[PDB]
Amino acid sequence: ATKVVCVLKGDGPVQGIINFEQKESNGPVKVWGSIKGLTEGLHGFHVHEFGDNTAGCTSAGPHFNPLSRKHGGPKDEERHVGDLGNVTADKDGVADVSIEDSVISLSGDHCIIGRTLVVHEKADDLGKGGNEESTKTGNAGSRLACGVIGIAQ
Amino acid sequence: ATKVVCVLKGDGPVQGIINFEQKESNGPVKVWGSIKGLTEGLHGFHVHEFGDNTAGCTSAGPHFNPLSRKHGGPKDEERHVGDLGNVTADKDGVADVSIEDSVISLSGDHCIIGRTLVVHEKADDLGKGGNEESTKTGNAGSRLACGVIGIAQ
Numbered sequence A, B: 001a002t003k004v005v006c007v008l009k010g011d012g013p014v015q016g017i018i019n020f021e022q023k024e025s026n027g028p029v030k031v032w033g034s035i036k037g038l039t040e041g042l043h044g045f046h047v048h049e050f051g052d053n054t055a056g057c058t059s060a061g062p063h064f065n066p067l068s069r070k071h072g073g074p075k076d077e078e079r080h081v082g083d084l085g086n087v088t089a090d091k092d093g094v095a096d097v098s099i100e101d102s103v104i105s106l107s108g109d110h111c112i113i114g115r116t117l118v119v120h121e122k123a124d125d126l127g128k129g130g131n132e133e134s135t136k137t138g139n140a141g142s143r144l145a146c147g148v149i150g151i152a153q
């Protein structure tokens, strides 16, 4: 019943369309779509706090973290609301995104609408990388593409 | 105390940053910023319903119209919520945007977050143009630049 969309673009060749759908307010959000122009392997995939693209992906700020928790993977209890883990690109540089998440929402306090979806340079280590940066950003590095998360038909 | 932003980009050289700020949920929204690469004169300036830029500005859909009213100018009681009238570009193609609106909001049912801001090819006639199209789109024509309205710091 609620649908939102995000068009990912950046400075490089990284570009994608990501769809979100939530059938009930207390329910999981299905996240699906395609990103191309990635290097083979894992790329960190986060909702960032600000829907602000004024100076590219950098104005999106840190991980969307309304509950003031530490960084984790999508399937940890200890995670930022915006922690969607990694998408995986093949030798062709295509990541086929198919995620179900119960922590993000398309309504209420956990609502991601008007925030930024970012795909990262490197792998999110999901907070288990063994430095301080792991429990903040997960060491996923630079922002390759982003977009503001918007209300869909 | 609520701040949102929108980066306008399109198929052409039209580009802009537009800021929105609302001190209280019951209060007016101040809208300000700059757009460049416009032709001299009036350009229709609307919040459209969907924050969907999957196929450029066209996927934004019609005027944000949660109350099912006819098109008007910002000063009319009969207006779409998204009816922000016109911005005016000079010989230099720059529009200095300075608007105060009491109908848009950054919270509640009239909330523009996650919707699309669009600047148009032509003048919005503010519903007084004397055809049926005036009461729907205001005859402002093509979409030159748009962006999704996002949460700011």
Ligand SMILES: *[Se]c1ccccc1C(=O)NCc1ccc(Cl)cc1
Residues within 6 Å of the ligand: A002, A003, A106, A107, A108, A109, A111, A112, A113, A151, A152, B111
């Ligand atoms: Se998303 C969200 C978070 C917190 C409070 C309210 C809301 C919300 O309901 N947003 C407005 C809206 C309107 C239509 C659609 Cl399809 C989605 C969201």
Ligand SMILES: *[Se]c1ccccc1C(=O)NCc1ccc(Cl)cc1
Residues within 6 Å of the ligand: A111, A113, A114, B002, B003, B106, B107, B108, B111, B112, B113, B114, B151, B152
């Ligand atoms: Se107002 C609104 C419209 C569409 C989607 C969500 C919302 C919303 O209320 N989100 C909660 C919110 C809004 C602004 C800020 Cl700064 C924080 C949280």
Ligand SMILES: [Zn+2]
Residues within 6 Å of the ligand: A044, A046, A048, A063, A118, A120, A140
């Ligand atoms: Zn990130």
Ligand SMILES: [Zn+2]
Residues within 6 Å of the ligand: A046, A063, A070, A071, A072, A079, A080, A082, A083, A136, A137
């Ligand atoms: Zn995080």
Ligand SMILES: [Zn+2]
Residues within 6 Å of the ligand: B046, B063, B070, B071, B072, B079, B080, B082, B083, B136, B137
């Ligand atoms: Zn209208």
